[PDB]
Structure formats: structure tokens, C-alpha cells
């Protein structure tokens, strides 16, 4: 009954550069094998016109999309886009801070491609705050991959960790979200003692503009059998 | 070597998605980009939640065929 794994399409925008492209490549690797990359630059402006994104979604059969854009107002801008029936469901701009680390900045370990990642979300706002609830929903939907009734313990390889940069009060600017990826190591104490090793990429996301779905679309996209 | 983790607010789980959710208090100063021991705190906190997650997973219907 469940759908196929959602496919991700990474799209370089007109203002995409090499540094932002490196970020695309390393983050796209986490989505293997359910991922496609475009090589050319496309003149897309989501919050002005959504038509091209809906076009690419249909013709490439990708319900997840990431546009790469950079200006001085919005530097290293990654616009995450989800579609339902090839129409835009929601959008959020996540801008990468300058303190980012690529896969080259971490010691390369052995890594089986295509395993179900684990998730940990740190921050109470992930459950109560409208903005952070969307982000939690987004990254769960984006990286979880294959749904299954059966799990091999040996397949529990890496974790995707997302942490809100400190608690905050209503009215203040929204704190960044800290994207981290760790490989698991387990030792004997039955339960094992768990330790983590960072493998990257390391990203600090600054929250930008947001597009939310209408009640009608939510009804259809979340309809129960 | 301890495999248990104590926290003020209990961690919630969505094991169908291999996910854990922690609503405990976060300190801004511990996570600021200028704080040098930043990533030590991120990983340490993550390690605790992964530990709790793995504990919950290993308590599911299980068999070593």
C-alpha cells in the first residue's frame, strides 16, 4: 500500500557556484541511490514562480527537490521543495553558514551506501513550533528512504542528527538548525555501549522564507486508507 | 560503559522511522558558533539519544537467526 521511495532532484540555480555545488554533492550522497543531479544552471525563482519546479517534478518523477542559489542577501541558499501530485506541497529556504565542513574535512571511513539512516532531533520546538515542525517533517521525509517491517541490526550504521541552536523565546530571531552525521560504533558492556564518529557533512542551516500547503492539499496528501 | 541515560524530560520515539525526539532544554551558549567545544556537545548529546534509541530498538520483537 505504501508508496515508492521518494526521489530527490538536485537543481543548480542561476547563481549556483562551486562551493555550493560541493555542498550539493556531499549532501546528495546521503540520498543515494534515490537521487538525481542536474549539471546545468536553471533560472528558477520559487517564491516568484513555482511552475518550473512542478514541471521538473513531473518529467523526472521526483517529489523531493533542492534548488541551489547564492546572493549576498541569501548566501548558500538551499531551497527544499516537496510536491504532491507534481504540485508544490511546501517550501523552505535553508541557508548554509560559512562554518560548514565537507566530506573531505573528515577521515573517510567504510560506508555502505543505501542503508536506512537513524534520526535524532534535539529541541522541544521540533514538536510545538510550526517552522521547526516542518523542518522535522521535511528531513524525515527526505532521508528515511525505504519503509520496511524488517530491520537488520547490522544495518544500523549511521545517524542523522538535527539540533536547534539553543532554546529561544517568542519574538526573537529563529535559531539555526545544526545538521550533523555520525557513524555508530558499539562495544560490549544485552545492550552495547554506543559511541559516535562524525563523518559529515557538517551544516548550520539559517532559516529563510517558507511556503505552506492549503488545507485542501493537506487533506489529500495526508488522506488515510 | 554505562548504557543507561537519565534525562529530566523523557525521549519520545518513532521506531518505524528509526527516529528519536528529545525535548530537553538546550543552552544557547553551549551551541554558539564561537564556542570552541561546540561539536563535543553536539556529539555527546547525540550519543545519549542514539544510545536510548538503540536500547528501544533492541527491545522490539527480535531474533538472532
Amino acid at each position: 500500500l505504501v508508496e515508492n521511495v521518494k526521489q530527490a532532484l538536485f537543481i543548480p540555480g542561476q547563481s549556483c557556484n562551486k562551493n555550493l555545488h560541493d555542498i550539493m554533492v556531499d549532501l546528495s550522497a546521503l540520498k543515494k541511490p534515490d537521487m538525481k543531479r542536474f549539471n546545468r544552471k536553471n533560472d528558477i525563482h520559487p517564491f516568484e514562480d513555482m511552475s518550473p519546479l512542478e514541471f521538473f517534478s513531473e518529467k523526472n518523477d521526483c517529489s523531493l527537490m533542492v534548488l541551489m542559489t547564492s546572493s549576498k542577501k541569501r548566501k548558500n541558499n538551499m531551497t527544499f521543495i516537496r510536491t504532491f501530485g507534481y504540485k508544490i506541497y511546501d517550501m523552505i529556504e535553508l541557508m548554509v553558514a560559512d562554518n560548514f565542513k565537507l566530506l573531505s574535512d573528515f577521515k573517510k571511513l567504510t560506508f555502505t551506501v543505501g542503508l536506512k539512516p537513524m534520526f535524532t532531533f534535539q529541541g522541544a520546538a521540533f514538536d510545538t513550533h510550526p517552522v521547526y515542525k516542518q523542518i522535522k517533517s521535511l528531513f524525515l521525509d527526505f532521508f528515511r528512504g525505504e519503509s520496511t517491517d524488517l530491520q537488520d541490526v547490522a544495518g544500523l550504521q549511521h545517524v542523522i542528527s538535527m539540533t536547534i541552536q539553543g532554546d529561544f523565546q517568542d519574538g526573537e530571531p529563529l535559531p539555526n538548525v545544526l545538521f550533523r552525521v555520525y557513524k555508530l560504533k558499539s562495544y560490549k558492556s544485552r545492550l552495547p555501549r554506543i559511541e559516535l564518529v562524525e563523518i559529515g557533512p557538517r551544516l548550520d542551516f539559517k532559516i529563510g522564507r517558507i511556503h505552506t500547503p492549503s488545507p485542501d492539499m493537506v487533506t489529500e496528501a495526508h488522506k488515510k486508507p | 560503559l554505562p548504557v543507561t541515560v537519565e534525562k529530566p524530560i523523557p525521549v519520545v520515539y518513532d521506531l518505524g522511522n528509526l527516529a528519536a525526539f528529545d525535548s530537553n532544554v538546550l543552552d544557547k551558549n553551549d551551541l554558539d558558533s564561537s564556542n570552541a567545544r561546540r561539536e563535543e556537545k553536539i556529539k555527546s548529546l547525540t550519543r545519549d539519544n542514539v544510545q536510548l534509541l538503540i536500547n528501544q530498538l533492541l527491545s522490539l520483537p527480535m531474533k538472532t537467526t
Binding site: 517533517s137 541490526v153 547490522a154 489529500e220 495526508h222 | 518505524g16 520483537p61
Partner: peptide, 22 residues
């Protein structure tokens, strides 16, 4: 095959579908 398997419970997080329910 020798391996440790788990049976995962139903997901609880309400994620949107990509396509209409048939």
C-alpha cells in the same frame, strides 16, 4: 543466514504522500 533481525512497529509521524491515494 545468521543475523539479528527486528520487527519495526507502525510509523507514527504523519508524513505527506507524493501522489494521490488510488
Amino acid at each position: 543466514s545468521v543475523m539479528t533481525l527486528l520487527q519495526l512497529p507502525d510509523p507514527t509521524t504523519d508524513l505527506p504522500r507524493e501522489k494521490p491515494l488510488p
